[PDB]
Symmetry: none
Subunit: 288 residues, 4 copies
């Protein structure tokens, strides 16, 4: 038996005619009939009759209507209320974001978001890797590189550049070719351990030297680099202020690393609760 | 928003997967997927997550399941409470039966019943023995072998004799074995539930063959088919084979080596609690030869 | 430390020169040097020296070479042997296929395959549904409709048609319009329970009548149909012989159901073991 | 076929995932994926299945792992056996340290060490306290809080005082609490491992706050940042904060309410079994102020 046929029947009873029931729902009358006669067959029990107008009920039809009517009514209004509450929901959202980049690249966005919406709470996990995240455990994932059933929107891009302190360069003549990096003390932070560099002429150079200093995070490498301990490869977005205040200097600028794209992964925004729709809209707004 | 889709959503949560749900309702997975999508589109709310094989509820899905379920359960009870009432020789009856034997062994009988009772409709679900059913979900269960005994009248309506056969083409090239032990040298073709062959000769010698087989399948009909094509020896109910035994196209081998006969039972709730439509069916089976 | 640098070193020792080692491998000498000097640095221990030719060893280099050389040799030949054995592997393959169609549509293919290759064993599971299969548990999946990381090749197509026995039609005037099906006894088997039919003019008709007979498999429905119990919708591939011997008759031929495609799902054939490559090739051959 | 890719395949199997493997080796997942592909392409054999999160071996993968592993293990031992040998003030040392405090508290010291010893190279892995390490995999472990005690010399090298702070902007609009109980009325910002605030005043009153917070994060630096933006009150090590306490940009609140001081330890294997490169490091830390 089809619950929607059974509700179509109720709309019929409450109204008092098939004419009345079909006009409110936008469902032709024989269809109703087809469906009420369908409902009769499934229940193995008859119901309404037509003279010209439709009407009445059977002894068991009244008892049945009186019985199921109240439950069906409630359902219709319960579902409507739950819908508004879930679509309008505030509270906690769960976000994953790349460990290295979050502090300087994401936090100003997250901070502005939170200031704007005091009733939305963020739970933020920072990871070096997004590939093993159970997507069902997160409202939004921010990752470096592409992944796969989630909607993926590119929101940004990082350019990795080579830097050293003026004290370092002052005692170690700057290299002008990336092969020369083998002659230098190198400082390397995950995920930029194997450097792949290309110049204007299409020359490619690979550097997988171990490194004087090798760390699982780039912020401590940048620190080592500021103390004059060698050359590092680092997202421009992690370096802005040091470049600007002049305590770190770009070398090998003709030698570029593959640009890396930043993605936001989420589920169909329109079917998300309010707290998540607002966040997605905000990020998009922030990045356009 | 369709209440049936909402109801379907509830059932999906209870079963824990689309395939599991598809099995119980006979709604194809693709249609289940489509209907859940339609539900979500009507609410503008994602209700379920599907990662891997794992189905989990969103917060919204969680709220819909918890809150709406009780009312959907009451309505279901309510409408079943009606269709459980006897309208004489009419209504639907729900039957469970084994995958292998039903077509050949039971359909003649089921057909004759439907012919006699045109207003009684049959919903027939086939499955391998395997998992046990909730008996309250069925009007009559046909099974092979003894049941749990639990809460059910059982009646033996038949039995099958499983025998070994090969095609003449196969035997032409692989001389008949004369002892069941020799089956290890032959190409075996096995279908569930006859995977582990337990054979006894008239001297009382018994052989157990659990070779994997050249061909193993989850049902016996495709195996008979491989056997007819001369691909080896299979063990198979006599009933599934008389056609082919009569034409020289399958021949019995190791005739002195027999397998345990297997009983066919009909199980049902006592007839005192049984509507007329089911009583007529039960009495029909009982009076039917084969 | 890089095992391939360490093996490159062995090729150097065994040969007696960088000249000798680079020519056999197609790897420039400074690269070797770059890599052997890389290997030295990672081990924090020196090795070979060049006059003009390269040669010799250190006290610890001999002990180390004598120690690691035999293990590296074995590895090179072990991996080669395992490779041949796995690429050449016979034995059991696991296949899933649609319950309804397998007997008449797949078995002649499977039978011919098995006759051709006696050392390949098939384990065959037939299911009504493929959507919940752990793809890692199957060598090949055959399914109706599309799915998603497996390679999917369409191998066939079924056309579902409407039939009844001559005895049935003889007492129930044949319908010429699909709406008329409501007036008939219908027999319905999974997955063809809700019939969706379209005619030449674009008229669509839907039938979700319960059915005099409704079953989880189509073969028993076809049987019911042969006994004159009503009209069914059924794959042409399940009906061929009954159509041909005339015990089942097509009605409503202007009214077509959506054709359903048969897919074979598998992993990159070239990286599969012999027993699976042969099967995939066979099916493709069988279907072209 | 690259033996390093084969070795990488072995490590993937041992760890059970690419992410897990990526963590231990500092090889990005994408590069691990690429290198396994290259291995498979060189053998023309699929070695691994990747469904869901679940990684499983093909038959071929199974044969490669079982057969080749022992030799790959012996080679690894063998080459580590060498680099374990003391070459004086040179070689690589492997250090584990906490995510939060390392940058500010330990890098000055690590930098000064590298400056003094240019031929000693540092591999530094940061992680939250969380899981326990295999100590045999590290030369020196820096941690917060007491260890398992197991098989390791421990030395206290510092401690942190965690204090409550907010921005003047925040306090302007949300009057300072005067009792820790009032924190329930405020916007809280929490970073692991300071999620459950356990505060005691000088009268001995103690408050436990386990509110989820307006902002919860897996590290403290992003939380200080939210705090500077005026988004609420956080609990945070003094050391991570003196810069901002000096400019009026963060102010301490509830100064009479204190949290348990947390110790910073260096752990290492006894120096008798320690090469020179590690001994120099250990002695350097010991002599270093902060």
């Amino acid at each position: 038996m089809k619950l929607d046929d059974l509700n179509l029947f109720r709309l019929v009873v409450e109204n008092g005619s098939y004419t009345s029931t079909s006009k409110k729902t936008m469902i032709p009358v024989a269809t109703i009939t087809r469906r009420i006669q369908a409902l009769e067959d499934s229940l193995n029990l008859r119901l309404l009759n037509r003279h010209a107008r439709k009407l009445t009920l059977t002894e068991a039809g009244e008892r049945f209507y009186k019985d199921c009517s109240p439950l069906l009514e409630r359902l219709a209004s319960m579902t409507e209320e739950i819908t508004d509450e879930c679509r309008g929901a505030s509270g906690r959202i769960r976000i994953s974001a790349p460990s290295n980049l979050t502090k300087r690249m994401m936090m100003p966005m997250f901070n502005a978001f939170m200031e704007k919406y005091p009733d939305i709470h963020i739970e933020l996990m920072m990871s070096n890797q997004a590939d093993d995240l159970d997507p069902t455990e997160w409202d939004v994932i921010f990752r470096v590189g592409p992944q796969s059933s989630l909607i993926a929107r590119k929101i940004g891009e990082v350019k990795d550049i080579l830097v050293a302190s003026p004290q370092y360069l002052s005692s170690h003549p700057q290299p002008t070719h990336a092969e020369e990096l083998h002659q230098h003390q190198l400082l390397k932070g995950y995920p930029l351990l194997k450097w792949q560099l290309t110049n204007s002429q299409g020359e490619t150079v690979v550097n997988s030297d171990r490194g004087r200093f090798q760390a699982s995070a780039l912020n401590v490498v940048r620190s080592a680099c500021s103390e004059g301990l060698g050359i590092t490869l680092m997202p421009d977005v992690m370096l802005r202020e040091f470049l600007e205040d002049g305590s770190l200097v770009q070398v090998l600028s003709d030698w570029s690393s593959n640009p890396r794209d930043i993605y936001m992964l989420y589920n169909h925004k329109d079917h998300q609760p309010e707290k998540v729709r607002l966040f997605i809209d905000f990020v998009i707004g922030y990045h356009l």
